[PDB]
Amino acid sequence: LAKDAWEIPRESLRLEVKLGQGCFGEVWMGTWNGTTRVAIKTLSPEAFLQEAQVMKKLRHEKLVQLYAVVSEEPIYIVTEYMSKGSLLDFLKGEMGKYLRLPQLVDMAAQIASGMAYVERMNYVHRDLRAANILVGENLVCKVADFGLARLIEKFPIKWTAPEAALYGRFTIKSDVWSFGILLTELTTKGRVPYPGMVNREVLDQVERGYRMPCPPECPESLHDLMCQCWRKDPEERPTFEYLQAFLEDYFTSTEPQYQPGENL
Numbered sequence: 001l002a003k004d005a006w007e008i009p010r011e012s013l014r015l016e017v018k019l020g021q022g023c024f025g026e027v028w029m030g031t032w033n034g035t036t037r038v039a040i041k042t043l044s045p046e047a048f049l050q051e052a053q054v055m056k057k058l059r060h061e062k063l064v065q066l067y068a069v070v071s072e073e074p075i076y077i078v079t080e081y082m083s084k085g086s087l088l089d090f091l092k093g094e095m096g097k098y099l100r101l102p103q104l105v106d107m108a109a110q111i112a113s114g115m116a117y118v119e120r121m122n123y124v125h126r127d128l129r130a131a132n133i134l135v136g137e138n139l140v141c142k143v144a145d146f147g148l149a150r151l152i153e154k155f156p157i158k159w160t161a162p163e164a165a166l167y168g169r170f171t172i173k174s175d176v177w178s179f180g181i182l183l184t185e186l187t188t189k190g191r192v193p194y195p196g197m198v199n200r201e202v203l204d205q206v207e208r209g210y211r212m213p214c215p216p217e218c219p220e221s222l223h224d225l226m227c228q229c230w231r232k233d234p235e236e237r238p239t240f241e242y243l244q245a246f247l248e249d250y251f252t253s254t255e256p257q258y259q260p261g262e263n264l
């Protein structure tokens with residue numbers, strides 16, 4: 001029972017409200033040391049802590065920061081608190097109506113920033129999507145849920161690169177594919193991708209070259225980025241470093257003549 005410095009005593013934690021239901025446990029919102037507001041992911045035990053394992057190694061402003069870990073049962077995992085909730089609920093909720101392409105591309109740029117770090121650290125997320133991005137104050141966005149994240153050595157198919165879904169080949173490039181899918185959730189205010197298609201149909205279609213078309217009002221340049229992310233060859237997909245820089249400069253280098261519309 002040799003715990004590390006991340007370990008803490010349950011007595012220093014006290015969940016106040018609940019934040020959501022979960023497959024492997026819940027997620028509460030409480031107080032740490034009675035002074036710092038935190039989020040807690042409650043509830044194999046050692047397997048459940050693998051997200052903390054990787055979260056201990058990752059440190060970046062665009063990744064939800066791990067604070068402490070309770071290695072006993074009920075096994076907890078304290079992290080930074082994001083006041084706005086998931087991007088998915090954010091996009092479809094009361095807030096979604098006012099977000100325009102400029103704010104949406106900035107949020108994408110931030111996510112691309114967190115993933116570029118994950119890229120440099122030679123890790124893989126494996127479950128990148130809006131439900132796993134958290135929003136905070138000032139439209140700050142951060143990557144979260146590293147339950148499946150690992151050091152590169154059925155998953156939600158609609159967000160998963162075909163080679164990862166079929167052959168188990170999860171690389172940073174399969175996260176890029178997911179990124180492209182995440183871009184459509186941003187540009188459509190969080191609609192589930194591949195409308196009307198069911199998993200089996202999506203898998204077959206994609207394999208046959210099918211790709212989602214340009215969302216209404218989204219510039220062709222942005223949709224082309226999405227298409228580079230969905231290239232059949234994992235290697236011809238852009239890096240996150242590229243995605244971060246392209247998105248950050250988007251309104252000056254790519255769409256300088258951009259004009260706001262009714263939805264984007």
Ligand SMILES: N#CCc1ccc(Nc2nc(Nc3cc(C4CC4)[nH]n3)c3ccccc3n2)cc1
Pocket residue numbers: 019020027039040041064079080081082083084085086131132134144145146
């Ligand atoms: N990890 C993961 C997936 C995942 C799944 C569901 C949730 N729902 C969640 N979360 C909130 N705030 C949070 C959450 C976090 C850390 C992830 C635990 N910090 N701040 C949150 C804050 C306010 C309102 C609703 C909220 N609803 C959050 C995350």
